[PDB]
Design a protein around this ligand. Structure first.
Ligand SMILES: CCc1cc(O)cc2c(/C=N/NC(=N)NCCc3ccc(Cl)cc3)c[nH]c12
Lengths: 230, 55, 224, 295, 338
């Protein structure tokens, strides 16, 4: 499974470019696709969404009227055509796949990333950084505004880790459910409004920035981002 | 048919040597299972409405 | 009242429903046949002419897609799986004409034609095939021609008048196989005599299944 | 004199029969959920509800004629009653012809199907509503001698109150679009079915001859049912048309027919609303099994 | 020793009959005739799982009592969501003559088979996103009638070759072959401890097998015709049978004889499915007369009738928590009854 994405670069202000994401390993024709961008210094923010058998397309309020998302399943490629690129669009764009059948793991695989240089439930991660040491238990806390619990028992919070020079990877899809290739030393525990992540033992790959994303409806706001440092 | 007959008689003689128990004790065991789990059987005893996932 | 993931699950379910109904529409347009026989009959010739369980055969003839479910490798009981074929357009039943005098070796001295007759009686009067037409093939008619002279039909049918003509013994065999049908006006049996060749058995099955399709459509419309 | 109560009793009996049969048909169709992906079943359901309403709008005319051609309540429930009657009698015949055309399509393209319906239903309904609109917008009931009538175009607004426009064509379009055209389409379709199945017939005994005899019996009983139910009333209506355009055989003929056969003709024409459900959803074995199971 | 072995066989059969007669001190409805016959329950339909286009032949619940798999003679195998009537997967089978299906206890694999004499195992949790067949088990000379997952890597299959078998899924091989039946084997049931399984066959007999040693432990008779369905009581000490003679029966292992016979004069149609409740009080038996008779186990009272289906009920199952019952019939419909 790999999602390599191309496009993006030095775009003149008030311009337009198309970002292309190519999928090879998996069955792209049966997965929803999210576009998630991340400013060079700021955190993550959701920028688009298309679904399998495209009938549900959702945009962020920031780029709603001037961005569009397009997919062509036969060639297994995801597209994003943006228009009138204002300067606040300088970010590293990521492609993330998802599926929503019962007991699925949405936001499981993320893409490589594309750089762009142009010249709602509130998620709060108050702690920007933490001095962490090898082989100790650490815990990350994330706060919400509206309750993420739903009448059907779900709790739509997603935990990611962004390694220094790497793309984010899913650790916890629900508030309490692990992922495929993730070590069992990560755990998740939340409540109506308060949410916490736990790591039993810090390792040589656990350093990075941790983020929390809501999925109650579709604003998909990410949090500020806790950055563990050793 | 000698081998088949030998296998059949061996199977029957293995059947014979079984330490059985009285039928009444067995029936008592099944009843004890029934009224030991009866309160948690939603098909037999209907579940309250705001606990049923099918309403 | 339900979350976004529930909405997307519903969308996936709707896509599955559309694919399922498309597949069903494709399947309901394709004609199904069940091949039965005595093994020694021309089941193999019939299947090879069209081109460890069910050997299901596909062929296309005049824009009708055909499926032929060649059971017979099943040594198990037919009563426990014959209802799964309830709904085939027609049953193709193959019996060898060169079996009245051919070795009485069904079990140990049973005439082959008698075995074929009881098999045909079982299939024709089965409760799953009350309205299922039967395409009866009377194969190996050439050996019938060059074996009537050597041996009379009285060994299998002593009630026969003794008229050992080719087109009287074959007619008698056909008549005795028709007479096993205990319920007419609800089932038609199409017997076939052309040659030991191709291009005609396939067309014969095509004609029989066209008649069955017309009858099914009339019954669906309620006229018949 | 004493026959008015008998005619009212006939109206009530046919109303009860239509209600019962159509409720049974609708319940059986609802139980057979999914419509079997067949065009004929949707048409049958539409026709069943149409003639259910057509036979439910009967007690109004029953009580109207029981008062010796008198309109009890002259209000918007003359607009509405005329609307429902003149829309149901059109949708009934139009779905009845839809039956014939869809049966012809199924039988002719039988093996072609092995190698829109809602749109047609709503088109039939829209044409029925368009044809019934005049009956509901130009009724204009008028008081005469202390008693009113749910009649049509009493005032002489334009081009004569008895000439072509303004009640010279209102119930001749009925003849030309509820009897003459539907019957022609139905007979053409069923003749084409008999012709199509005749080639296949030409073993014949028990397979072809018996099947063709059964098919011709069915496509004969259907057309005979329609023609016999809708012949007397449309014949009286065309007598009215011919006596209002040119002919004047009033003496002891038109008055007698209007006072004797018109309620009988109307109840016989409404009897189609109970003969259609049986012929189209009862004699079929698939619904027969469901009825037997639900009995 | 030509007929001496045979004579020893009949003498041993007579000895077993005498030993079985010695155990039955009294009938069941003489020691259970003091407790109330709880029932009179109709369980109206709550969900209707439409989507199939042919006869439904087998269904199996998931261990979460939320997902269930269904097999139908259209080359389809659907994992539903009984809570919201959603479809999670739709597997296109190579062979459309499926009349058994299974759901792995872990929820990762689904088994399938039928008149192809091959048990097909599907991977539901692949990374590529599509459900794909893992391995096609092929060692049987007759139609597969039942497959139940021993574990994530082991399966048990019953075939119409008078033989049940146990497989190692990773190697796809006969780990042990269970022979000893005279007619075709129609149904299986694995004990909760997963150490024994009963198999009812067309020879009007049902036997108990040990999965490890690979030999029969007990043999049960009493029916007049083919045994169609079988299932374990929740304790694993008893099991219920269902025959194409309009009669159900309940056998208990320690007594090694029948205890109760579920029959009536007005039922002449046989049985296609038998399942037990959470406490094992309800013997839900799918009969051939278009309905599922909810029997009482401790007595023979027909507590309830699930008359929803308009064609023959082929499969029914009870959730692991006993919340729902899902009957499937030849009308291409699944109904969740609560
Ligand atoms: C069977 C379908 C059908 C067609 C039709 O043209 C009239 C009627 C009908 C009659 N109700 N009275 C109304 N609607 N206006 C009455 C129009 C009228 C009739 C005769 C005379 Cl002398 C004066 C005025 C009940 N069923 C009908």
């Amino acid at each position: 499974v790999q999602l390599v994405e191309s496009g993006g670069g030095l775009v003149q202000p008030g311009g337009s470019r198309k970002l292309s994401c190519s999928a090879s390993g998996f069955a792209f024709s049966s997965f929803g696709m999210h576009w998630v961008r991340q400013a060079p210094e700021k955190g993550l923010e959701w920028v688009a969404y298309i679904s399998s058998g495209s009938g549900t397309i959702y945009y962020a309020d920031t780029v709603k009227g001037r961005f569009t998302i397009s997919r062509d399943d036969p060639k297994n490629t995801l597209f994003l055509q943006m228009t009138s690129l204002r300067s606040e669009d300088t970010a590293m764009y990521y492609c993330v796949r998802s599926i929503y059948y019962y007991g699925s793991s949405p936001f499981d695989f993320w893409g490589q990333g594309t750089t762009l240089t142009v010249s709602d439930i509130v998620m709060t991660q108050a702690t920007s950084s933490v001095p962490v040491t090898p082989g100790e238990s650490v815990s990350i806390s994330c706060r919400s505004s509206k309750s993420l619990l739903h009448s059907n028992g779900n709790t739509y919070l997603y935990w990611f880790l962004q390694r220094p020079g790497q793309s984010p990877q899913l650790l916890i899809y629900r508030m309490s459910n692990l992922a495929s290739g993730v070590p069992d030393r990560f755990s998740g525990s939340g409540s109506g409004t308060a949410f916490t992540l736990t790591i039993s033992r810090l390792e040589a790959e656990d350093v990075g920035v941790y983020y929390c994303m809501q999925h109650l409806e579709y604003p998909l706001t990410f949090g500020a981002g806790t950055k563990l440092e050793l | 048919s000698i081998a088949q007959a030998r296998k059949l008689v061996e199977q029957l003689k293995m059947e014979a040597n079984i330490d059985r128990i009285k039928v009444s004790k067995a029936a008592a065991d099944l009843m004890a299972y029934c009224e030991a789990h009866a309160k948690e059987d939603p098909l037999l005893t209907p579940v309250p409405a705001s606990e049923n996932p099918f309403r | 009242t339900v979350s976004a993931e529930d909405k997307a699950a519903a969308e996936r379910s709707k896509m599955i429903d559309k694919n399922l109904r498309e597949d069903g529409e494709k399947a309901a347009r394709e004609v199904k046949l069940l091949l039965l026989g005595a093994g020694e009959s021309g089941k193999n010739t019939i299947v090879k002419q069209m081109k460890t369980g069910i050997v299901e055969t596909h062929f296309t003839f005049k824009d009708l897609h055909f499926k032929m479910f060649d059971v017979g490798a099943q040594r198990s009981e037919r009563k426990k799986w014959i209802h799964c074929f309830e709904g085939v357009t027609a049953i193709i039943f193959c019996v060898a004409l060169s079996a009245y005098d051919l070795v009485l070796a069904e079990d140990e001295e049973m005439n082959r034609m008698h075995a074929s007759m009881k098999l045909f009686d079982s299939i024709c009067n089965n409760k799953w095939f009350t309205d299922t037409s039967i395409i009866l093939f009377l194969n190996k008619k050439d050996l019938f021609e060059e074996k009537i002279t050597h041996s009379p039909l009285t060994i299998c049918f002593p009630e026969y008048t003794g008229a050992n003509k080719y087109d009287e013994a074959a007619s008698y065999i056909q008549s005795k196989f028709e007479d096993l049908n205990k319920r007419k006006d609800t089932k038609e049996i199409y017997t076939h005599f052309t040659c030991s060749t191709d291009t005609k058995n396939v067309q014969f099955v095509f004609d029989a299944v066209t008649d069955v399709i017309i009858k099914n459509n009339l019954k669906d419309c309620g006229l018949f | 004199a004493r026959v008015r109560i008998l005619i009212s009793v006939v109206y009530w009996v046919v109303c009860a029969l239509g209600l019962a049969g159509n409720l049974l048909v609708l319940y059986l169709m609802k139980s057979m959920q999914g419509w079997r992906k067949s065009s004929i079943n949707l048409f049958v359901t539409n026709l069943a509800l149409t003639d259910f309403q057509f036979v439910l709008t009967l007690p109004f005319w029953a009580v109207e004629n029981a008062l010796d051609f008198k309109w009890p309540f002259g209000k918007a429930m003359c607009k509405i009653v005329s609307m429902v009657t003149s829309m149901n009698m059109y949708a009934s015949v139009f779905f009845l012809t839809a039956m014939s055309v869809t049966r012809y399509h199924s039988v002719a393209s039988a093996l072609k199907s092995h190698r829109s319906a809602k749109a047609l239903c709503v088109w039939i309904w829209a044409l029925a509503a368009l044809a019934s609109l005049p009956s509901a917008i130009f009724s204009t009931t008028v008081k005469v001698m202390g008693e009113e009538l749910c009649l049509v175009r009493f005032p002489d607004k334009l081009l004569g109150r008895d000439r072509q426009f303004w009640l010279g064509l209102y119930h001749s379009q009925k003849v030309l679009l509820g009897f003459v055209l539907p019957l022609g389409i139905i007979i053409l379709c069923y003749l084409l079915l008999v012709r199509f199945i005749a080639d296949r017939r030409a073993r014949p005994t028990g397979a072809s001859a018996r099947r063709l005899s059964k098919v011709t019996k069915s496509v004969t009983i259907v057309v005979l049912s329609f023609f016999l139910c809708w012949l007397p009333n449309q014949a009286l209506t065309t007598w009215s048309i011919l006596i209002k355009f040119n002919a004047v055989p009033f003496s002891q003929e038109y008055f007698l027919c209007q006072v004797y056969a018109f309620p009988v003709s109307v109840c016989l024409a409404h009897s189609n609303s109970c003969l259609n459900p049986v012929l189209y959803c009862l004699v079929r074995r698939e619904f027969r099994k469901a009825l037997k199971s639900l009995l | 020793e030509l007929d001496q072995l045979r004579q020893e066989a009949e003498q041993l059969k007579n000895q077993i009959r005498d030993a079985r007669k010695a155990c039955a001190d009294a009938t069941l409805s003489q020691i259970t005739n003091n407790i109330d016959p709880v029932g009179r329950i109709q369980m109206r339909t709550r969900r209707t799982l439409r989507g199939h286009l042919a006869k439904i032949y087998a269904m199996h619940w998931g261990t979460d009592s939320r997902l269930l798999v269904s097999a139908s003679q259209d080359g389809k195998l659907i994992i539903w969501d009984s809570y919201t009537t959603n479809k999670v997967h739709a597997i296109p089978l190579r062979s459309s003559w499926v009349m058994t299906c299974a759901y792995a206890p872990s929820g990762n694999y689904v088994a399938c088979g039928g008149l192809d004499n091959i048990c097909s195992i599907y991977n539901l949790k692949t990374r590529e996103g599509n459900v794909r067949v893992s391995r096609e088990l092929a060692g049987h000379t007759g139609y597969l009638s039942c497959c139940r997952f021993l574990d994530d890597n082991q399966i048990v299959t019953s075939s119409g070759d008078t033989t049940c078998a146990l497989w190692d899924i990773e190697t796809g091989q006969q780990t042990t072959t269970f022979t000893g039946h005279t007619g075709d084997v129609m149904s299986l049931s694995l004990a909760p401890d997963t150490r024994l399984f009963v198999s009812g066959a067309c020879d009007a007999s049902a036997k108990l097998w040990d999965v490890r040693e690979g030999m029969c432990r007990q043999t049960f008779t009493g029916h007049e015709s083919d045994i169609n369905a079988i299932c374990f009581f929740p304790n694993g000490n008893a099991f219920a049978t269902g025959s194409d003679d309009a009669t159900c029966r309940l056998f208990d292992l320690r007594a090694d004889q029948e205890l109760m016979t579920y029959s009536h004069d007005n039922i002449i149609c046989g049985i296609t499915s038998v399942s037990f409740s959470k406490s094992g009080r309800l013997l839900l038996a799918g009969y051939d007369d278009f309905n599922c008779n909810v029997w009482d186990a401790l007595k023979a009272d027909r507590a309830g009738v699930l008359a929803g289906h308009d064609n023959r009920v082929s499969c029914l199952g009870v959730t692991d928590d006993g919340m729902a019952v899902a009957t499937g019939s030849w009308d291409s419909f699944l109904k969740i009854w609560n």
